[PDB]
Amino acid sequence: FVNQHLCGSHLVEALYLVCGERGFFYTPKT
Amino acid sequence: FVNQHLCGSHLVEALYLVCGERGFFYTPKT
Amino acid sequence: FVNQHLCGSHLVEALYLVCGERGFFYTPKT
Amino acid sequence: FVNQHLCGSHLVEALYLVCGERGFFYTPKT
Amino acid sequence: FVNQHLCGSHLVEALYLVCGERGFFYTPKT
Amino acid sequence: FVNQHLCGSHLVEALYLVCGERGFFYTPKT
Amino acid sequence: GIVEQCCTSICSLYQLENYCN
Amino acid sequence: GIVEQCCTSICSLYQLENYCN
Amino acid sequence: GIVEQCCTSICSLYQLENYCN
Amino acid sequence: GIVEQCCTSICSLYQLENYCN
Amino acid sequence: GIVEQCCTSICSLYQLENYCN
Amino acid sequence: GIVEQCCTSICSLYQLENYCN
Numbered sequence: 553f554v555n556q557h558l559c560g561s562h563l564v565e566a567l568y569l570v571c572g573e574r575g576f577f578y579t580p581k582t
Numbered sequence: 583f584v585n586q587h588l589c590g591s592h593l594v595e596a597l598y599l600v601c602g603e604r605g606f607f608y609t610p611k612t
Numbered sequence: 613f614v615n616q617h618l619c620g621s622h623l624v625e626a627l628y629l630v631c632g633e634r635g636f637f638y639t640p641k642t
Numbered sequence: 643f644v645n646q647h648l649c650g651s652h653l654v655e656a657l658y659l660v661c662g663e664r665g666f667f668y669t670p671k672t
Numbered sequence: 673f674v675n676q677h678l679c680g681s682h683l684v685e686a687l688y689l690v691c692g693e694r695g696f697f698y699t700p701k702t
Numbered sequence: 703f704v705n706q707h708l709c710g711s712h713l714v715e716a717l718y719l720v721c722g723e724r725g726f727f728y729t730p731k732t
Numbered sequence: 733g734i735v736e737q738c739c740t741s742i743c744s745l746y747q748l749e750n751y752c753n
Numbered sequence: 754g755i756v757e758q759c760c761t762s763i764c765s766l767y768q769l770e771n772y773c774n
Numbered sequence: 775g776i777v778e779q780c781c782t783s784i785c786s787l788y789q790l791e792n793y794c795n
Numbered sequence: 796g797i798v799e800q801c802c803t804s805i806c807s808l809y810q811l812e813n814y815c816n
Numbered sequence: 817g818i819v820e821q822c823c824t825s826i827c828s829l830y831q832l833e834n835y836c837n
Numbered sequence: 838g839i840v841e842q843c844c845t846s847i848c849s850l851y852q853l854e855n856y857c858n
């Protein structure tokens with residue numbers, strides 16, 4: 553695997569791919 | 583605004599657009 | 613809803629989600 | 643260039659790539 | 673990490689996320 | 703057609719659309 | 733729920749907004 | 754039209770280019 | 775236009791509805 | 796192969812990683 | 817948080833698994 | 838390469854065809 557800048561939409565897409573079925577949370581303000 | 587048919591990462595993208603800096607949880611069934 | 617920087621592809625995707633069936637126009641040079 | 647099968651926001655993305663700074667209209671049937 | 677169902681540009685996006693600066697080849701059947 | 707900055711994911715998506723069936727390679731480090 | 737609803741039938745952005753924090 | 758054609762059968766980038774301004 | 779209103783500065787989903795047909 | 800496997804059934808990120816350079 | 821950890825600085829896929837439910 | 842040719846500077850769809858198999 554690897555280390556990239558993931559901003560905006562790209563971060564949630566990556567979470568989708570990583571977490572899938574499990575689901576995730578996206579909380580910018582934290 | 584219109585209804586949308588939204589699967590996979592498209593759902594998470596739409597949540598990102600709709601929720602913004604408020605964030606969201608992504609909670610798929612099982 | 614919320615206020616984000618939407619550039620390139622991201623802007624047309626957002627228009628797709630917002631407008632859907634209605635359709636839209638994307639005219640950078642205006 | 644090859645043929646492409648293109649649904650939802652993928653269509654609008656391809657129009658964005660193909661049209662660029664010329665822009666485009668997105669005109670779905672009904 | 674979970675299994676993922678991945679078609680069209682979603683496959684290439686996942687390869688981009690997984691491979692990063694190492695790169696990859698995209699080799700569809702025929 | 704046209705000339706745009708295509709970075710990260712956006713570059714591989716564009717390659718997907720351009721190359722399709724043919725497939726492509728994405729080699730940042732070259 | 734929503735994931736299933738938006739994907740198997742359809743949903744509105746206003747329904748999605750129920751998933752925001 | 755095009756949206757339906759690209760999605761239900763297939764289309765070329767050259768056909769898409771008909772939708773540019 | 776839209777690019778100025780949304781990429782350089784920011785816009786709402788409601789402003790984007792200005793560009794719907 | 797992989798493109799067909801990930802799309803027609805399912806695949807893991809670990810399987811994808813076989814396509815990296 | 818996640819935005820700080822991933823957009824301004826960089827993160828791994830493994831760190832992103834911290835935000836899975 | 839491609840990253841230099843397309844992200845830092847700009848490229849055409851035709852240049853991207855250089856990276857097709």
Ligand SMILES: [Cl-]
Pocket residue numbers: 559560562622
């Ligand atoms: Cl971006």
Ligand SMILES: [Cl-]
Pocket residue numbers: 619620622712
């Ligand atoms: Cl971008």
Ligand SMILES: [Cl-]
Pocket residue numbers: none
């Ligand atoms: Cl899709």
Ligand SMILES: [Cl-]
Pocket residue numbers: 562709710712
């Ligand atoms: Cl980006």
Ligand SMILES: [Zn+2]
Pocket residue numbers: 562622712
């Ligand atoms: Zn982007």
Ligand SMILES: [Zn+2]
Pocket residue numbers: 592652682
């Ligand atoms: Zn898709």
